[PDB]
Amino acid sequence: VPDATRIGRATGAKAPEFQELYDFDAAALTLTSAVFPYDSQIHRAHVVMLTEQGILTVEESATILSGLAQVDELAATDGSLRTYLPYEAALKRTIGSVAGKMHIGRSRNDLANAGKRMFLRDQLLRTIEAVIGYREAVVHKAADHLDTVMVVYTQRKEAQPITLGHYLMAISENLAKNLDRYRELYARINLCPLGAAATAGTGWPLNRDRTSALLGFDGLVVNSIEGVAGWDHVAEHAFVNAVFLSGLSRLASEIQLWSTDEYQVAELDASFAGTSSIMPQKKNPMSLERSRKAAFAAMGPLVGILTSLNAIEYQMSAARVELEPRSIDALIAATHAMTGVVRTLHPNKERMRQYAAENYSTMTDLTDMLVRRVGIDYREAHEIVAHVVITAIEKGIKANKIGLDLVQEAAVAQTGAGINVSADDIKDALDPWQNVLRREGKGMPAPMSVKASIDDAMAELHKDRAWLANATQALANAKQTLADSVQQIIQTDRKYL
Amino acid sequence: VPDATRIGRATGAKAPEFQELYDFDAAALTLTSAVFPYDSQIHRAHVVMLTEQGILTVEESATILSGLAQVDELAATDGSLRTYLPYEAALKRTIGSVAGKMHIGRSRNDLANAGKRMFLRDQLLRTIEAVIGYREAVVHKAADHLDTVMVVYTQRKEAQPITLGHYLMAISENLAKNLDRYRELYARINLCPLGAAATAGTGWPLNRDRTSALLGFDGLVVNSIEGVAGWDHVAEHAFVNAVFLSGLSRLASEIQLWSTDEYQVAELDASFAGTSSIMPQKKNPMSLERSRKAAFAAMGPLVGILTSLNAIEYQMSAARVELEPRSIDALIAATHAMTGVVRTLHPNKERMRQYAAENYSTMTDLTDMLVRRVGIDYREAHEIVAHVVITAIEKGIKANKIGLDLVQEAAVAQTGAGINVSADDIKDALDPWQNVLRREGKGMPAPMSVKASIDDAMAELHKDRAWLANATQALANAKQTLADSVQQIIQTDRKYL
Amino acid sequence: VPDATRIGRATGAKAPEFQELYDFDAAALTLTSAVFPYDSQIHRAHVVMLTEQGILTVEESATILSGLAQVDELAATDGSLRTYLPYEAALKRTIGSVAGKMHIGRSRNDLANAGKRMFLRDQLLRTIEAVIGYREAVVHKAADHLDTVMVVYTQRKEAQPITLGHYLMAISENLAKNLDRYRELYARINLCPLGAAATAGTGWPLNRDRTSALLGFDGLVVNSIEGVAGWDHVAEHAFVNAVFLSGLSRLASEIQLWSTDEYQVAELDASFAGTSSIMPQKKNPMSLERSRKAAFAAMGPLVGILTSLNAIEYQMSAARVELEPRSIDALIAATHAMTGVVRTLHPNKERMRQYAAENYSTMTDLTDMLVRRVGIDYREAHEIVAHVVITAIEKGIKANKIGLDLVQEAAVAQTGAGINVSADDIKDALDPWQNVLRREGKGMPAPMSVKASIDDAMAELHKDRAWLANATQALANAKQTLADSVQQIIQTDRKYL
Amino acid sequence: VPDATRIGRATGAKAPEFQELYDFDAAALTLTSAVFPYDSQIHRAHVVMLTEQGILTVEESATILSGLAQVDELAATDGSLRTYLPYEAALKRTIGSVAGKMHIGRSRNDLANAGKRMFLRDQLLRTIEAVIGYREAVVHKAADHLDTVMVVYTQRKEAQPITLGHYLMAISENLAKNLDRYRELYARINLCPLGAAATAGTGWPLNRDRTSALLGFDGLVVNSIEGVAGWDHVAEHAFVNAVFLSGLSRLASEIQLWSTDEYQVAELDASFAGTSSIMPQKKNPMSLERSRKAAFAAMGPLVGILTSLNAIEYQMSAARVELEPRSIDALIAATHAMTGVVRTLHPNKERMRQYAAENYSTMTDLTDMLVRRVGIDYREAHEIVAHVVITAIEKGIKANKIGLDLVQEAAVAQTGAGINVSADDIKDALDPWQNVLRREGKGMPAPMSVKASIDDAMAELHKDRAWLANATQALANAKQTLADSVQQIIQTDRKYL
Ligand SMILES: O=C(O)/C=C/C(=O)O
Ligand SMILES: O=C(O)/C=C/C(=O)O
Ligand SMILES: O=C(O)/C=C/C(=O)O
Ligand SMILES: O=C(O)/C=C/C(=O)O
Ligand SMILES: O=C(O)/C=C/C(=O)O
Ligand SMILES: O=C(O)/C=C/C(=O)O
Ligand SMILES: O=C(O)/C=C/C(=O)O
Ligand code: NA
Ligand code: NA
Ligand code: NA
Ligand code: NA
CATH class of the missing domain: 1.20.200.10 (Fumarase/aspartase (Central domain))
Known part of the structure; x- marks a missing residue:
């Protein structure tokens, strides 16, 4: 059925x-x-x-060993013989008292x-x-x-x-x-x-x-x-x-x-x-x-x-x-x-890919870019980018549509000052694939790095x-x-x- | 007090x-x-x-590292500084915005x-x-x-x-x-x-x-x-x-x-x-x-x-x-x-020693002696010695006072037959120290065997x-x-x- | 067997x-x-x-209900029918598509x-x-x-x-x-x-x-x-x-x-x-x-x-x-x-009874008696009786053989002073049965108190x-x-x- | 800060x-x-x-009770006094030996x-x-x-x-x-x-x-x-x-x-x-x-x-x-x-609401409607509606856009036969709010039923x-x-x- x-x-x-x-x-x-x-x-x-x-003599041993096969066979269908003292007793009933010597x-x-x-x-x-x-x-x-x-x-x-x-x-x-x-x-x-x-x-x-x-x-x-x-x-x-x-x-x-x-x-x-x-x-x-x-x-x-x-x-x-x-x-x-x-x-x-590009997981790279490019400390860049996100969500702007104008507004809103980065800087920072490629150290998601881990894991699996x-x-x-x-x-x- | x-x-x-x-x-x-x-x-x-x-430049690094010592000192008495973001903020208040670069x-x-x-x-x-x-x-x-x-x-x-x-x-x-x-x-x-x-x-x-x-x-x-x-x-x-x-x-x-x-x-x-x-x-x-x-x-x-x-x-x-x-x-x-x-x-x-000699822990050696000496199987000897114990307890006879007469009665009671062992055989089997000395294999209580384990453990402790x-x-x-x-x-x- | x-x-x-x-x-x-x-x-x-x-109509209900008995019977020996969808499918194979209406x-x-x-x-x-x-x-x-x-x-x-x-x-x-x-x-x-x-x-x-x-x-x-x-x-x-x-x-x-x-x-x-x-x-x-x-x-x-x-x-x-x-x-x-x-x-x-009388569980009553009789506080009486025990153990004196002389020595040893109690006071305090009888409050071991608990428990068991x-x-x-x-x-x- | x-x-x-x-x-x-x-x-x-x-006499009781207040106060700052024997000893040092009588x-x-x-x-x-x-x-x-x-x-x-x-x-x-x-x-x-x-x-x-x-x-x-x-x-x-x-x-x-x-x-x-x-x-x-x-x-x-x-x-x-x-x-x-x-x-x-209307949670009501309307058993209706969903997902048709044509195709595909229900029958079955309103029994999501539970819960909260x-x-x-x-x-x- x-x-x-x-x-x-x-x-x-x-x-x-x-x-x-x-x-x-x-x-x-x-x-x-x-x-x-x-x-x-x-x-x-x-x-x-x-x-x-x-x-044990070889003769006693042979008698017991042959008996063990016989009781094993009985126990395949008789579950009562699968604990020791019942098993030994069945061995004794099968071959005689020499059964007891196995203990x-x-x-x-x-x-x-x-x-x-x-x-x-x-x-x-x-x-x-x-x-x-x-x-x-x-x-x-x-x-x-x-x-x-x-x-x-x-x-x-x-x-x-x-x-x-x-x-x-x-x-x-x-x-x-x-x-x-x-x-x-x-x-x-x-x-x-x-x-x-x-x-x-x-x-x-x-x-x-x-x-x-x-x-x-x-x-x-x-x-x-x-x-x-x-x-x-x-x-x-x-x-x-x-x-x-x-x-x-x-x-x-x-x-x-x-x-x-x-x-x-x-x-x-x-x-x-x-x-x-x-x-x-x-x-x-x-x-x-x-x-x-x-x-x-x-x-x-x-x-x-x-x-x-x-x-x-x-x-x-x-x-x-x-x-x-x-x-x-x-x-x-x-x-x-x-x-x-x-x-x-x-x-x-x-x-x-859609989520990666649209739902703001790229904002760290935007933050790191501000630090790397204009030299501000991480905490101030972080606060700017958080405002970018807050504003982006409010205006219904997906991460991959965040541009220079939105980043500058957030910088001005949180700092009173603009920030000297280009639209290309922002575009590349928000590209989720570039986020992956930039993460190229040991254990990071860049294909070259993951491939290295796979090679190592393949050698470990052989072992x-x-x-x-x-x-x-x-x-x-x-x-x-x-x-x-x-x-x-x-x-x-x-x-x- | x-x-x-x-x-x-x-x-x-x-x-x-x-x-x-x-x-x-x-x-x-x-x-x-x-x-x-x-x-x-x-x-x-x-x-x-x-x-x-x-x-980081050496100059930035020095500024942060010196700040870390100062905030560590504040945190020795101010428990609020022992989680990361409060600690970082105190570092920023101590040395300025370069504090943020440590993250x-x-x-x-x-x-x-x-x-x-x-x-x-x-x-x-x-x-x-x-x-x-x-x-x-x-x-x-x-x-x-x-x-x-x-x-x-x-x-x-x-x-x-x-x-x-x-x-x-x-x-x-x-x-x-x-x-x-x-x-x-x-x-x-x-x-x-x-x-x-x-x-x-x-x-x-x-x-x-x-x-x-x-x-x-x-x-x-x-x-x-x-x-x-x-x-x-x-x-x-x-x-x-x-x-x-x-x-x-x-x-x-x-x-x-x-x-x-x-x-x-x-x-x-x-x-x-x-x-x-x-x-x-x-x-x-x-x-x-x-x-x-x-x-x-x-x-x-x-x-x-x-x-x-x-x-x-x-x-x-x-x-x-x-x-x-x-x-x-x-x-x-x-x-x-x-x-x-x-x-x-x-x-x-x-x-x-009293318990060892008196409370019947020696009965296994009595059983093993019957097997070794008269060649009966372990299960039949076991049944005889159990009767020895049952009888001994009933008559208030401590293990070290069990003798030939009591063992023969038990053998006759359970088997109809006596058993060809001597009073010396029984005495030696019931001697608790001889029980220990006879247990002389690997991991067993004989002093020579325990000493061997101690030697090994002493070498392992060094490692x-x-x-x-x-x-x-x-x-x-x-x-x-x-x-x-x-x-x-x-x-x-x-x-x- | x-x-x-x-x-x-x-x-x-x-x-x-x-x-x-x-x-x-x-x-x-x-x-x-x-x-x-x-x-x-x-x-x-x-x-x-x-x-x-x-x-459901009565006719549909009857058809299903009769089918349920038939599938139940099949499932007594066919464990595959004991989960719902297999059971329903077997019901459908037994009575037709009306089987599905039971869900x-x-x-x-x-x-x-x-x-x-x-x-x-x-x-x-x-x-x-x-x-x-x-x-x-x-x-x-x-x-x-x-x-x-x-x-x-x-x-x-x-x-x-x-x-x-x-x-x-x-x-x-x-x-x-x-x-x-x-x-x-x-x-x-x-x-x-x-x-x-x-x-x-x-x-x-x-x-x-x-x-x-x-x-x-x-x-x-x-x-x-x-x-x-x-x-x-x-x-x-x-x-x-x-x-x-x-x-x-x-x-x-x-x-x-x-x-x-x-x-x-x-x-x-x-x-x-x-x-x-x-x-x-x-x-x-x-x-x-x-x-x-x-x-x-x-x-x-x-x-x-x-x-x-x-x-x-x-x-x-x-x-x-x-x-x-x-x-x-x-x-x-x-x-x-x-x-x-x-x-x-x-x-x-x-x-x-031997343990109760001999192994010093009665010492609390000895202590309580000193408080009740001579009016010393519990902590000082406690210290005296502890010395009684320490001394008793050292001299091999079982609790029920502790007498006036041993209690007075302990009092003198710990206090410099004797204590005005009689040999009868001590005897009665050390009598383990009197220890039980004196413990006659709610939930205590006196037979009258335990019997009261039994009566209550017997009424609770009826409920x-x-x-x-x-x-x-x-x-x-x-x-x-x-x-x-x-x-x-x-x-x-x-x-x- | x-x-x-x-x-x-x-x-x-x-x-x-x-x-x-x-x-x-x-x-x-x-x-x-x-x-x-x-x-x-x-x-x-x-x-x-x-x-x-x-x-205790009233005099002894008063002395102890006054002492308890004094030791309590010491223990507010001295944690060593918060276990019993240290506390009792501090009471004794405070009021004298009568302290011991509280035990x-x-x-x-x-x-x-x-x-x-x-x-x-x-x-x-x-x-x-x-x-x-x-x-x-x-x-x-x-x-x-x-x-x-x-x-x-x-x-x-x-x-x-x-x-x-x-x-x-x-x-x-x-x-x-x-x-x-x-x-x-x-x-x-x-x-x-x-x-x-x-x-x-x-x-x-x-x-x-x-x-x-x-x-x-x-x-x-x-x-x-x-x-x-x-x-x-x-x-x-x-x-x-x-x-x-x-x-x-x-x-x-x-x-x-x-x-x-x-x-x-x-x-x-x-x-x-x-x-x-x-x-x-x-x-x-x-x-x-x-x-x-x-x-x-x-x-x-x-x-x-x-x-x-x-x-x-x-x-x-x-x-x-x-x-x-x-x-x-x-x-x-x-x-x-x-x-x-x-x-x-x-x-x-x-x-x-969007998810409710679009992501197929209404399909049960579609199934129930086929049973209620054309009298087929639940299992056959279920199979038809599953095909509706499978087809809908394949064609990118959200649940609230499922119509008569899609339901008939699924019926024909799985049964060889159409099914005598109207576009209005389907529309009402797929309306997520009507799904809620139809679920009007005890404990079900219809507002009248949930309100009844709220009334009961409000009375229970008072208790x-x-x-x-x-x-x-x-x-x-x-x-x-x-x-x-x-x-x-x-x-x-x-x-x-
Ligand atoms: O430890 C025991 O008492 C049991 C031993 C055995 O059944 O071999
Ligand atoms: O927000 C917190 O409670 C902690 C965060 C963290 O340590 O990651
Ligand atoms: O995983 C997080 O969201 C938190 C990260 C962080 O606080 O560093
Ligand atoms: O698919 C199953 O394993 C079981 C489902 C159920 O009983 O709900
Ligand atoms: O909760 C489910 O998806 C399963 C329901 C059912 O098998 O009846
Ligand atoms: O001796 C102790 O640690 C505690 C004893 C107690 O509270 O009963
Ligand atoms: O049960 C005990 O030995 C301790 C009693 C106590 O300290 O009061
Ligand atoms: Na691990
Ligand atoms: Na182990
Ligand atoms: Na309880
Ligand atoms: Na419950």
């Missing part, structure tokens, strides 16, 4: 990235189900390590912290991947809009002329720093707490480095209390999500204002807009508002997690609040949605992608090593022992 | 670090007054840079963002210094308590034997990672947005690198929109404060429980306790609870800042919530207080202090370079122009 | 209320699925009202706000019911513990003697005020926004009172903008949940400390405790910590909702954050759990239950009236038109 | 209400200094009550909770007064704009025609419910905890009702634990502030969008706008953004307070976070500012003011009774004893 929301001005299908905003809530796993497959990997890595340490030297506490880290680790790479895709859309969009003159706003008022490319490279710089935040967090998430057992380690001679390496961790959470009590990485994950999403909310809000009926300086692609069941004229920025909704919602986990940490001791505690799958899923959906919003955004170039590929490959390599090791044990036992 | 709170069991004076918790609220500056001296430095750096760029190419927006960064930069070094002092107290305390056997808790229940040194090194590892968070944040705070002007740069040929260098920044916030709209570093500063303080709350809570009348395993130094105006018996953990109060309060700025960022566009906005001096001051007071709390904490070594000294010296060097440059201009003009 | 967590000291089954804490997360509905059945009721009420208004004068905006209110209304009655059950457990528990002498704490230090009944009646008074908060909120939730349509009403002659009455609302959200933009009730619902749960967290924390191995003044019923997979001695307060977890998590929705309201205009907005089913479900589970925790809590009466029964019956009556009306239309059309 | 910010387009002085936003931060009292005068009242009320109870039966705990309640009580009446003034401005503004046709927005897109009066009465209804929230809170704040002493009452025969009555409380916090541990009213105060301010943020945001350069449908009074130090054209909505800033900041205390309550037991705790004066001061400043913003807002009536006058007079009466009683004691002792 058709998408019944695609009626009237909501033509065609929702963009896939837009549809993600509708699907993640019902599709989200519980934390228990999301972490369960990582627990299964931990069982295997732990058992392999115990085998290397001689705590030697181990706790639910270090198992759980490690499993959640593995989950968050994968979700952090998933997030970094999405943020990179978002930055790619932003920078690649900017590269096409070096000449798209438009006003920048401060305090929701037209400030000065820039370009759309200039604006998008602000977002790129924001995302560059959020990627740093996420990679910095990744180094703290990707630490293995296994071997802490309950909170104090164990007398069993575990090799904590081997379990860590088998599970793709880059290091250990060393202190055993820190290994089970430590939760700051969960709080930090929630925070970076929240602050990253606050910037995504701000872009969404920016574009929503751009695409108001009143601004009309940009239009959402049809595939990122919805309509109204009652008002046929609506082209609703539903992608933007649902993206903002996720940003706002991300405040929740951050506060809950920090509240729970403020409520306890420096202990393992079952009262700690988690970062849950549905929260991350919402971030990914919003990030994907805004990636497509940016990619497909349709700027109204003509109206953007972003390389960092992600390296982190991902390290995990894939370890997971394959673990699988090989499991198979070796099971098969050697079957054929030779 | 005497400290009227030092009555009854609140003997002697408050520790200075404890007193800090009482003073910071009334003493805290407003953000305006805290940032004002940095604005004054920015005026000088900006003016020097304009002079290098030939935008060429500049805005309140990039001035304010830069000034707040300079404030937060200094406050971040102040915070890093305090966190290092806190970690030093923790590690140096741990070094004296390698042999201080005591129980670790999970879920506020006695879990297993550790040592006080082992526990403190959990905190050290937490603080190591919070110092990473803060240094990572410092690299983002210490970026100069000057030259962004209103939000789009300027046509004036500023040298943004020179202003940045004169003000001790390590780099630029490049994009001019990012330079004025960017606020994530403020949110991040608030977050690291909050998460760092949540760990400080947890230690404070831990110690508060240790020092309850019922636990009695540690006692606060008198200089960190208060008493009651009514109940003469009270030795109140007032340092701890006021430290937790600050931790809880630090949630506030984090939420307000993120809320404000979620509420706007990617613009300069006057609606953004700030991180205020009093919030940082509270963190410093709480950190200093807990530094002294830890340094002077008096553990009850005898009672710590922490070196990083702080280098960051501080860089700022001091730049501030002196700026002062030299100002004096050169003023004096050259006075004597030679 | 057995509950694999019920091993060792976790004997028997989890209490049903305890199990609720494990089930609500996987069982929680999405908001869409939770609100859908209320949307179906709204369709019927709206259509009936349109029929009364002559906007005359209506929007998704007032439909959605009304449906969510109906959901929250039912969930608020569900919550009030649970809070009443919680208060009933607290008061009925208190009634059995008028004589259960124990210490009250301030700042986690023993303060003065009370009774367990006295403590529980603090919770009762807290819950009384939270029930007021919830009933006050109910009056704002139970207002009907239908008729606001998109945000400005409609030219169709709706009878907004009839739709409201058919749906059990007690009044209208009058202004049509307020009807769709209004969200404060959602924020308020989240807040009362959060503050109510913060008090539940505090009781859970209180009991957790009571039931520490070190306090040992209360023990959780086995059916509300868990154990450890590794440490056989653990009787873990898992009901308490998971209850606190829900309290902490409830901060999340409150902050997200308020953030979203701070981010928008006074408009209908799709960016607003919702209060979701799983959040309320968590509150109900925690409230039920703590209801059973309180009901089945096992106080250690002997140890409670709580009456208020809930009346609110519930009003909704049941309206729902039956609506069902009758639907059937009348369908059947009259089938048989007579 | 002149207000140096009143330059260029920032003409005249800041409105006084606008200036409040600049002054409250530096002017805010600490909580200690704000509560101190209430503590002094409590000392007097407590001492008077002790005198009535015969615990008989009392604690810092019930003193502090009571003093903070008295502070919050007065601040709640101050807040209710400001909210009433805000509602008065809103309703009185609405009364002048029954005919000010303009579009209402949903999702920041033009939705349907309303009037400015209609919009303002949404705010009135919001404020009516926030006033209910505040008055409901007032009944819980205005409860006296005195007599709880430390947390368990006292053996002294206090008359808790007399102290409560002398201090203007309407009832007791009965249970003595609740009297000192109870804090929910602080959380609730913070919440109502936050949710009330979120609605104020939304109006501020709404007006900010109205007053963008692009909407230009309203203009702030000059006295509520600022300008830029660099951009002479700026008329900045600084009142609005600083008002939103306060709304966002109010999230902070709410989260800190709730966090602290989630962190402790149901005890008196010094870790609880307070609601501080500066937070309330910010709310009052923002409320006053927005009161003046609303009062002096200048709507652009001509442009408001709001009466409730405030009654609450205020009750406190003034009690304060005068207390002063009379103090004077009677002091003077009777001086002249007759």
